[PDB]
Design brief:
Chains B, C: This is Multidrug resistance protein MexA. The structure is cut from a larger assembly and holds 3 copies of chain A. Chain A has 40 residues and is mainly beta. Helix content of chain A is 0%, strand content 30%.
Chain lengths: 40, 81, 81
């Protein structure tokens, strides 16, 4: 009985994570009329 | 996100680890007595093709990768890189 | 939930089980016809050195531990504790 073992050794690694996402307006508002009329 | 830097830990390749119950991590290694044992590892992250074992395998241990296709714990074997 | 009753379950030692494809649990036991069969067990947890088989081995069954180093399903053998 034989197997393919690998010698585990201490390595120096960095822990970084990537979070996917979409950009979005900080705040949004709509412009609307509140009286009837013609745009000058 | 910067999750800090780990001093020195073991990065056991996934080609030598399994997840029973779709969660619990179990590995198969050969002790100094040329005999295989069954230790439960705590690998959560995934770097490249290896898994960062937080607690389950210390520095030095030998992880059986090519040969687990047919074996069992409590038996002896040969070590071929 | 914790039900207050001596919960009994088969705890088959890992020294007599294997995990092919790094997941599937398969064991080798000897039927009443003194012949070895191949039944798939559903052991997920790991207590001490044994595995909690949820479904695959009932009470009474004989688990082959020392003798799998060279065998096959469909042959007869002797039962030595």
């Amino acid at each position: 009985p034989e197997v393919g073992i690998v010698t585990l050794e201490a390595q120096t690694v960095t822990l970084n994570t990537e979070l996917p996402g979409r950009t979005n307006a900080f705040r949004i508002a709509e412009v609307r009329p509140q009286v009837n009329g013609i745009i000058l | 996100l910067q999750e800090g830097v780990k001093q020195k830990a073991i990065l056991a390749p996934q080609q030598g680890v399994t997840r029973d119950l779709k969660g619990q991590a179990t590995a198969l290694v050969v002790n100094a007595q040329n005999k295989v044992e069954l230790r439960v590892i705590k690998a959560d992250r995934v770097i490249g093709d290896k898994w960062l074992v937080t607690e389950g395998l210390n520095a030095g241990d030998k992880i059986i990768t090519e040969g687990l296709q047919f074996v069992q714990p409590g038996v002896e074997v040969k070590t071929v890189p």
